[PDB]
Amino acid sequence: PTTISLLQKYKQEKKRFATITAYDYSFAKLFADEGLNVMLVGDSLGMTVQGHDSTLPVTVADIAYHTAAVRRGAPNCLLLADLPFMAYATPEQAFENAATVMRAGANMVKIEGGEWLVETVQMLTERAVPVCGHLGLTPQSVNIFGGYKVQGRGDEAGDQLLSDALALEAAGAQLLVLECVPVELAKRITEALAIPVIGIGAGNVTDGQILVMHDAFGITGGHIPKFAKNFLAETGDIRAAVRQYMAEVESGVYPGEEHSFH
Amino acid sequence: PTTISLLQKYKQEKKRFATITAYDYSFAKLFADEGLNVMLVGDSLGMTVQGHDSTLPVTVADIAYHTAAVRRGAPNCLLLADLPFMAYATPEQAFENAATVMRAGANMVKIEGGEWLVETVQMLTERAVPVCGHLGLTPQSVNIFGGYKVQGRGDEAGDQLLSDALALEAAGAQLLVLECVPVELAKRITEALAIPVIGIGAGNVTDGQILVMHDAFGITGGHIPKFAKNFLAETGDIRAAVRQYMAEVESGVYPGEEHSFH
Amino acid sequence: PTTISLLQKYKQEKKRFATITAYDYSFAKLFADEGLNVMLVGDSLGMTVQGHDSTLPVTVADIAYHTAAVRRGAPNCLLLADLPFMAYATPEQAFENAATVMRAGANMVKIEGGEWLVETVQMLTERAVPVCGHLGLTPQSVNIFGGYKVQGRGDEAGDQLLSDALALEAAGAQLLVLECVPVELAKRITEALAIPVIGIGAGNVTDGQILVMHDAFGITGGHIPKFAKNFLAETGDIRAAVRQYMAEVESGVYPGEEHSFH
Amino acid sequence: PTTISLLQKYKQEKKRFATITAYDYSFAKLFADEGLNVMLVGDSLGMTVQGHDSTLPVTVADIAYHTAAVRRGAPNCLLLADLPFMAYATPEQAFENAATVMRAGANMVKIEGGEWLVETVQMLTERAVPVCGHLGLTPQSVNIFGGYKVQGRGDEAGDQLLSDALALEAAGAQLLVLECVPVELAKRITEALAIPVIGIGAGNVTDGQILVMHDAFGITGGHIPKFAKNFLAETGDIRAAVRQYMAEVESGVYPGEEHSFH
Amino acid sequence: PTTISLLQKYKQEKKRFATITAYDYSFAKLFADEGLNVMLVGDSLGMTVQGHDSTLPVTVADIAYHTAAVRRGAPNCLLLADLPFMAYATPEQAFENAATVMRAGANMVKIEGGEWLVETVQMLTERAVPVCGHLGLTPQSVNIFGGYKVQGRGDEAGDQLLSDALALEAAGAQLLVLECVPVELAKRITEALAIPVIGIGAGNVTDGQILVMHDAFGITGGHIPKFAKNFLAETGDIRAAVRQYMAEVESGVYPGEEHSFH
Amino acid sequence: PTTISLLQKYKQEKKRFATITAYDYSFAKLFADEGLNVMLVGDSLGMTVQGHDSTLPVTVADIAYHTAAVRRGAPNCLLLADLPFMAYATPEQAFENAATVMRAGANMVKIEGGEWLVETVQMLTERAVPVCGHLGLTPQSVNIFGGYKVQGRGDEAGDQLLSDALALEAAGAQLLVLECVPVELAKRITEALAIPVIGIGAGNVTDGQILVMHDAFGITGGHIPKFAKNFLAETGDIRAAVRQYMAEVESGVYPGEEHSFH
Amino acid sequence: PTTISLLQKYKQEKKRFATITAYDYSFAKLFADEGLNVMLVGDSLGMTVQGHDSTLPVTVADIAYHTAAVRRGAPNCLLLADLPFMAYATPEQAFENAATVMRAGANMVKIEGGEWLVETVQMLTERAVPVCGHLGLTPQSVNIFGGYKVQGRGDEAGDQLLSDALALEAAGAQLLVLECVPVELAKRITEALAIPVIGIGAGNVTDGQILVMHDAFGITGGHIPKFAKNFLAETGDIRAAVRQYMAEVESGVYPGEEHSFH
Numbered sequence A, B, C, D, E, F, G: 001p002t003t004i005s006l007l008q009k010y011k012q013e014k015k016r017f018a019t020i021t022a023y024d025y026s027f028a029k030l031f032a033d034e035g036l037n038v039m040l041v042g043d044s045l046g047m048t049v050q051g052h053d054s055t056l057p058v059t060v061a062d063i064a065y066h067t068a069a070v071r072r073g074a075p076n077c078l079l080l081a082d083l084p085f086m087a088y089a090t091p092e093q094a095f096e097n098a099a100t101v102m103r104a105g106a107n108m109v110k111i112e113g114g115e116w117l118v119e120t121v122q123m124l125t126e127r128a129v130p131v132c133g134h135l136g137l138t139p140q141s142v143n144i145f146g147g148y149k150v151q152g153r154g155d156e157a158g159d160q161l162l163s164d165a166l167a168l169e170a171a172g173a174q175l176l177v178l179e180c181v182p183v184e185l186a187k188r189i190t191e192a193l194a195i196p197v198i199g200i201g202a203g204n205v206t207d208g209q210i211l212v213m214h215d216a217f218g219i220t221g222g223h224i225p226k227f228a229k230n231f232l233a234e235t236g237d238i239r240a241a242v243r244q245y246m247a248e249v250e251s252g253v254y255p256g257e258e259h260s261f262h
């Protein structure tokens, strides 16, 4: 079975690895059959699956529904499940909601934010729940930011994110997702932290990559995000698209400069 | 907004029309944007979405969840939603369950079965719920049949299906799905009924066609049903696949003889 | 306190009377202060208040909420409340749901449909619930009709509405709303029935009129229904618009030919 | 997957087949791995699992719990689940409770009783639920008869059982269990019915056999019933015991004369 | 009845004693009838009974269901019940969930972890709940560890486990389970603690032993843990297997070197 | 295990038998230990246990509570449980409430009333629920009668009770309680029925007797019912008192003339 | 109405007083009629009434049920009600559960334990709940002790109980139950405390006495506890037995040396 141990090993080897979102049996099974064995059941489903204009409406029950479907499709994958908006407002609530998504199939939970989470991370880890951190453009805070804007620009913002990343790691987070930050900051965080750092919109300097699968096969309409690539476009079939994604991540061909912020 | 009126116009014009399954915002919007504006939120999602070995586990709440998602994706489509297993066991229950899915965004409910449903259909239509019939291989009854097997062969079984189709029409059904029957029988039913008849594994003699989108884009693992076609394999991206499907249904190229039973 | 018996009087006197929808304290109080004393808490609120594309999502609790608010603003009005989509699917269900809106402040419930409702109307009236019928374009059935289309054209459809109107009356309906039918049919129904007939898109030949207040008093966007008139445009203030509406109904100036179907 | 189709085929070929009770993953998997592919999740669990002195306390939720566990262990088996005491008192209840156990993983429900069940069976099968009848000794009626004794002795009782068997088959039951009746009667019934008949305490003249697993491995201990055999003996191999049971049923040597009543 | 007082007496006399998991009436009764009077209703049932790939899905209500069953079969046994994943995340939750399993028939609750549980253990005991600790490989933490791996290797690890064992004893725990630890560490802890230490994968140096009964008595099959023994294979019948397990524990023949980690 | 079969044998031997009410473990155990093996968990507990001035407040849940307690005390007794006031108002409700008390440990349910119950009794018995009838002074109807009064005096009332007794027997009732009627009438009913008739206030002409145990040991204050006898008296031994009640029922000494109505 | 103030006066007077358990209307009224005016609705009902082998299954709802019944029988008695197992695990839970039994008719609540309870007792009394303490053999802790064993022997344990007693008093407890301790310890505690101490198995040195009514009339089977006396055997009837109990408590004849521990 694919474990957190394996990703830590890949970091020690400087072997860049691919990860992907998934929300149903069919895609989860397709990814697993191609050897893409790290999947995130993310509250991005609020948008790509449910059709809301933010991730805030997603509930813990919604995550648990999609987590079970993904687990059925990929019984041996490493499965990260988001805790959605206001599902980790106190350590007690975090314990309850983490347990719901883990009992539904997840191996790890992902929660958004910085140093305020330290206690929650320490206590979750102690209670058998592995935690993936999430910094930068954390979409649950879209209303605070006033939009989906690049974070971590400026010495002060950058320095806050570095210290948050170190705090989460010291609290026991075993992975970190870094979203839409300058590549120069992503490199600094990746070098500073012993745990694996998984980037989206953070350039090819991270230890791993994530993408929303709907951007990845041009299912999503309009212009895809700057940081995303349609791998279906130039393979012909979805399985081939998956394999191209895996190989470009490992070689560092993806993300390219065109997919990165500064 | 596409309505049942439009499909009745197409039957009168002998313009064969394509319809497709859909279970989320992203696919629903893609379909609508390409001009495919009849979608079924079917209990097939029990298999393709949830990963069960049959459609039986799918609940009314599941259908409602997926219905609301599809409706956000395709605000103007004609949206058919299945009533799942044991959700129409009595007229009263049918009323309540139909209402749930209609409030969630459906314009019509689809239910499986023949003559025994006549009272239910009459009453539903009085109560503002349009009904699509479903005859032939009705997958909710997979345990009765002992598998997914072709129905309607031989004069007795064929005559009964014709009888059932006319009965459902007389009860107020405004559409009918015929699944996995001889083309010959599909032709008789299509010519006998004034309402539009939508086929899947019924050949190209029906007024319209349906397929599960997961087979259409090659997502599903293994070898696809004889009656299905992977359109993504010949077109290369998903939107062009959708347009090829629309075109080939209209020209009668799909289903071909190879997709048909006798 | 305005009662059904006052309306019945007005018909005997051939005094045409105005009625209006209302969904909150402020407008209800404004209308009452102007002497517009017949209000409908209708499932139109699903669209004009809630913002859905149909009335179907409206619940009995929604109706009861608005009903209480309207009653607080207009303690002496004749208050009709709609039973919404699938809230009267059986007589038992109709009893429970009628009772909820009446306990919340309604004097009378309005239900949509023809002959199939006779038993329900008989039984409701027996159990102390006055009933207003609703024929023609009955908006809960929009999916059956395939849109908001004029009903009652041609001899058969006209004969069915006239017969349905007489059957609801015989069953104990004390009022009837007729919506979007030819004026000539509205005239025949109004003349055939002893109970008052309130028209909307039925021309000026009915005993009374109704309008959604958002259309009447200049709030609704784009092009209001063809049968509606903006009374605020040519009176300047909402109270004057209310008085003009009342006056023009009584004089038969509203609805005009421009607001009428044939 | 083993289906009702396959057992019907076995009857047509005169290939006697084994079936067994199961209530958890570990035993269901052991059985499936030996090719013993028909499993009964019966209310007998009330005694062997729960430890009550009767099956009456067993609930529909209990059956669904055990059903899901057996289905995990044996994904491809034909899984019969009992409806327990008072879970089929009306057709409407039978529909609800049958649906629960089938959604949890059953392929067919087993209900005890004769001719009074005909309507229920007819309506279940319409509504996609296969039914296994159960005649002879029917343990849910223990307080009626005041014990567990051999049924069908004498002409009147025997003729009544044959009549009930034919009536259940005519109503749509696709399988029948006969429990503790004379071999001669079991032969009459098996020969009269086109559907397969599965015996326990009915001798080797039936199409198939059932036993309680807890008796089959000497788990229960004490005096095992006359009709049962401990296959484990002193072999120290449960898998070998299962194989021996399957083989003795197929050859017709189990049940022996010593396990039979006249 | 068998009590904690008895096991404390056994440790004083240096009589090593056998304990076993049980989850139903039939096996509990069998074990009691052979004199094996200490039973654990463990969250191992998630895997052996329910068929999940981990213990995390097991609920408090599941534990309570199986506890009542075992108590029916073994009215006089000492009955330990696990609190499952996240059922003791705070003292208050531990109180509530412990009380549930104790009311259902347990004499004592087992919880996994070290120093962080001291306050919970202290408070549980004040509130009438005896506690069994559990150190070493604690299977609810499978996702933290990344698998089922041997714990306590090296100086820092072994010292920490000794410290935690003494800490749990001082907090009031009356028993300790030690799982998959080097034999030498198990001997250090066993000699340091006054309370009985029960081993699994800890060698024969503990005061007693535990195993999952499905592994021990031949149901799991060829793949049982390294530290387990199939006692049925060499004894022929399940009762004789139970007696052999009891005897070999007491003689120190089981566990052997082949079952032990260093 | 005492069964209805035994009582039926006793009638055939003309061996009169004692029965008693019980509502807790201790008295049930005491009774069982003396061989008083037929107990009623009666809605009389509304008065003797709960302290109400009538039995009407007793709920099904109350009966089930007391039933389980009596069953724990007397595992082998024949245990009748009353369905309380309005717990058998329709056959469907009777099935649900009977099931509840049978699952809690009852072998048979008792319900009050005559011919209007025929369908309920037929259907209960068909669904594995043995029924005891109850005629004469049926205390749930105290408000109808305007108190606790002797029933069946006069030809018309007497004839109706005889008709009712025969009707209930023919419907499938297996026992009948006859309460506070003329001895003369009790003799007719007893001779006319094949099933056993248990008297209270019916004289010594019935097949058996029942009393409220609180009257039977001079626990109840005031003057006890004319028909009751305090067997404890000044003997200082409740067990001796039980044996005396049993002995006097069988010899015919109790009830005496003094305890009888004419 | 008997109050706590009365018992405090009896302690000053050294007038030893009897108390008794009661769980129903009939015994409560009997006790009140004889002037035995202090009653405990104890969790002992778990054994004597419900038939469990310990008091742990008893719920707050059970206490409240029996509490209302006793209050109906004895409107003017001083009514103590136990908080059962884990009903006072935190102060906040104690408040809620104490209020439930007080609203049901209790005047005071009894809770088991020593110094750990001080905050709970202080806060309960502040919030209008009088508290009775309970030390020595506290039956909710049977699993901790390994049975029902005399407590307080030897100086360590004795001194600890005296300390706890004084601590509960200083916290606001208004009464104390002492159970199964040496007589000389009961004397030390009774003399050190200003509040009344009620003994059971504590000898005649306490200010009052408690007995389980089922032991007091020889209802309980077998050989009653050493500290109990069957008062009925020598008095003939239950009221005389109650009067003898009262008298022998006041004279100091009960408990005798034979009912005492050392």
Ligand SMILES: CC(C)(CO)C(=O)C(=O)O
Pocket (backbone or CB within 6 Å): A021, A040, A041, A042, A043, A044, A045, A082, A139, A177, A179, A200, A210, A211, A212
């Ligand atoms: C896309 C990503 C990795 C960043 O928000 C995510 O967290 C999600 O899918 O929900």
Ligand SMILES: CC(C)(CO)C(=O)C(=O)O
Pocket (backbone or CB within 6 Å): B021, B040, B041, B042, B043, B044, B045, B082, B139, B177, B179, B200, B210, B211, B212
């Ligand atoms: C595609 C079809 C018609 C197959 O039964 C369907 O109903 C579904 O998608 O659920």
Ligand SMILES: CC(C)(CO)C(=O)C(=O)O
Pocket (backbone or CB within 6 Å): C021, C040, C041, C042, C043, C044, C045, C082, C139, C179, C200, C210, C211, C212
């Ligand atoms: C608009 C009107 C009067 C007619 O549909 C109505 O019934 C409503 O407001 O809901």
Ligand SMILES: CC(C)(CO)C(=O)C(=O)O
Pocket (backbone or CB within 6 Å): D021, D040, D041, D042, D043, D044, D045, D082, D139, D177, D179, D200, D210, D211, D212
């Ligand atoms: C084995 C059989 C058929 C006998 O009652 C059964 O029904 C059960 O296991 O519950």
Ligand SMILES: CC(C)(CO)C(=O)C(=O)O
Pocket (backbone or CB within 6 Å): E021, E040, E041, E042, E043, E044, E045, E082, E139, E179, E200, E210, E211, E212
């Ligand atoms: C397997 C064992 C004995 C050790 O983890 C256990 O705790 C369980 O059975 O759940």
Ligand SMILES: CC(C)(CO)C(=O)C(=O)O
Pocket (backbone or CB within 6 Å): F021, F040, F041, F042, F043, F044, F045, F082, F139, F177, F179, F200, F210, F211, F212
């Ligand atoms: C004893 C009797 C017959 C009194 O009606 C009874 O039914 C009861 O105890 O509830």
Ligand SMILES: CC(C)(CO)C(=O)C(=O)O
Pocket (backbone or CB within 6 Å): G021, G040, G041, G042, G043, G044, G045, G082, G139, G177, G179, G200, G210, G211, G212
């Ligand atoms: C009699 C006493 C005081 C002994 O525990 C008691 O608390 C009870 O009856 O529950």
Ligand SMILES: [Mg+2]
Pocket (backbone or CB within 6 Å): A042, A043, A044, A055, A082
């Ligand atoms: Mg996310």
Ligand SMILES: [Mg+2]
Pocket (backbone or CB within 6 Å): B042, B043, B044, B082
């Ligand atoms: Mg479908």
Ligand SMILES: [Mg+2]
Pocket (backbone or CB within 6 Å): C042, C043, C044, C082, C139
């Ligand atoms: Mg309306």
Ligand SMILES: [Mg+2]
Pocket (backbone or CB within 6 Å): D042, D043, D044, D082
């Ligand atoms: Mg069964």
Ligand SMILES: [Mg+2]
Pocket (backbone or CB within 6 Å): E042, E043, E044, E082, E139
């Ligand atoms: Mg465990």
Ligand SMILES: [Mg+2]
Pocket (backbone or CB within 6 Å): F042, F043, F044, F082
């Ligand atoms: Mg009664």
Ligand SMILES: [Mg+2]
Pocket (backbone or CB within 6 Å): G042, G043, G044, G082, G139
């Ligand atoms: Mg107590």
